[PDB]
């Protein structure tokens, strides 16, 4: 059950589910595991918001353990394509692809809540079959790994070498550490 | 699914219905009869609204059932409107096939999307005679798919055949060079 709320407008009174109500303020939620359908929904919301106002910032509130890379990249490419800056906020956690989309936010507009945490690592995969096919899929995931590291470097300011070193295994970052690493810009203070 | 308001007076829509109003259709996830028929219905509806305006098919799919995908393919080629295609995330197998099936010059990859192509997958169990029937059929399907891929990509038939015997990945730039997509969608 998603709560309903009322918005007072000169056109009259309107009822919205609470997420639709926040969408009206250009706030989009990325919640739980990243996968095709939740990701596509985020893409649609971003395209819709750009159409509404191409100049106004959009906000992406992230609480996610990560998920499917290709699904995540549909969001990433949408973020970079649209005219509005996409400001990102980490609530609770942003791990794996979650952390990637967090750092993909507009420079200067990426935030961590004080007690949220981040985790970064390398792509995980799996294939079964003929050696010939294993090689094909192995090569591909290595290419994916390379691309993801390049993009992480671009957004954090870290060198490719450093990113590679830091993502070979699970690496946790506190909010302050995320700021220091160039992964977000600041901690949301009050 | 979030709801939104369009001023027309003003009314309400779920977000996908809102984008459909702008002639945008989403092809998301597994390709199969039900999601495919829904897409066909949307295409027919859009054509009926305006037979000459472009339609947009946003693809993020690992592919799926061939016949289901071919219902979409044939609808795309039948309707008068150009169907512009955009690959976001991935377009693999039947997904890649439908991506390349878009109107010439209006097929796009997002910068970090990827494509994968390969030959038909199938399986049958029973008498040798029936095995022959179904093997023969999937080979004919394979032939048609390769011919259509050649047509849309501009690659020679023999080259398509070689490239699809096993899984082949194509980055966005590689998809452009391959003639599977026309260009990369940049800001």
């Amino acid at each position: 059950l998603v709560p309903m709320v009322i918005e007072q407008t000169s056109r009259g009174e309107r009822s919205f589910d609470i997420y639709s109500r926040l969408l009206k303020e250009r706030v989009i939620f990325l919640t739980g595991q990243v996968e095709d359908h939740m990701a596509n929904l985020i893409v649609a919301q971003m395209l819709f918001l750009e159409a509404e106002n191409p100049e106004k910032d959009i906000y992406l509130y992230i609480n996610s353990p990560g998920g499917v890379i290709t699904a995540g990249m549909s969001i990433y490419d949408t973020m970079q394509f649209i005219k509005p800056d996409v400001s990102t906020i980490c609530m609770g956690q942003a791990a794996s692809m979650g952390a990637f989309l967090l750092t993909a936010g507009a420079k200067g507009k990426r935030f961590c809540l004080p007690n949220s945490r981040v985790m970064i690592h390398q792509p995980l995969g799996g294939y079964q079959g003929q050696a010939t096919d294993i090689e094909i899929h192995a090569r591909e995931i290595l290419k994916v790994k390379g691309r993801m590291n390049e993009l992480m470097a671009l957004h954090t300011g870290q060198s490719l070498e450093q990113i590679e070193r830091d993502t070979e295994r699970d690496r946790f970052l506190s909010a302050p550490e995320a700021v220091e690493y160039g992964l977000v810009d600041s901690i949301l203070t009050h | 699914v979030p709801m939104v308001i369009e001023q027309t007076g003003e009314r309400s829509f779920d977000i996908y219905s809102r984008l459909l109003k702008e002639r945008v259709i989403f092809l998301t996830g597994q390709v199969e009869d039900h999601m495919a028929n829904l897409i066909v219905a949307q295409m027919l509806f859009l054509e009926a609204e305006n037979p000459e305006k472009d339609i947009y098919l946003y693809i993020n799919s690992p592919g799926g059932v061939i016949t289901a995908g071919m219902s979409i393919y044939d609808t795309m080629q039948f309707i008068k409107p150009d169907v512009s295609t955009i690959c976001m995330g991935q377009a693999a197998s039947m997904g890649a096939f439908l991506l390349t099936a878009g109107a010439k010059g209006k097929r796009f990859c997002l910068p970090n999307s990827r494509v994968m192509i390969h030959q038909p997958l199938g399986g049958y169990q029973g008498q040798a005679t029936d095995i022959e029937i179904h093997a023969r059929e999937i080979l004919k399907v394979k032939g048609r798919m390769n011919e259509l891929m050649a047509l849309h990509t501009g690659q020679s038939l023999e080259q398509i055949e070689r490239d699809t015997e096993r899984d082949r990945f194509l980055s966005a730039p590689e998809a452009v060079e391959y003639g599977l997509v026309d260009s990369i969608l940049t800001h």
């Binding site: 159409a51 | 002639r23 945008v24 472009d54 947009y56 946003y58 955009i86 796009f108």
Partner: peptide, 6 residues
């Protein structure tokens, strides 16, 4: 997706 897909 506008500029041109729409």
């Amino acid at each position: 997706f506008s500029p041109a897909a729409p």
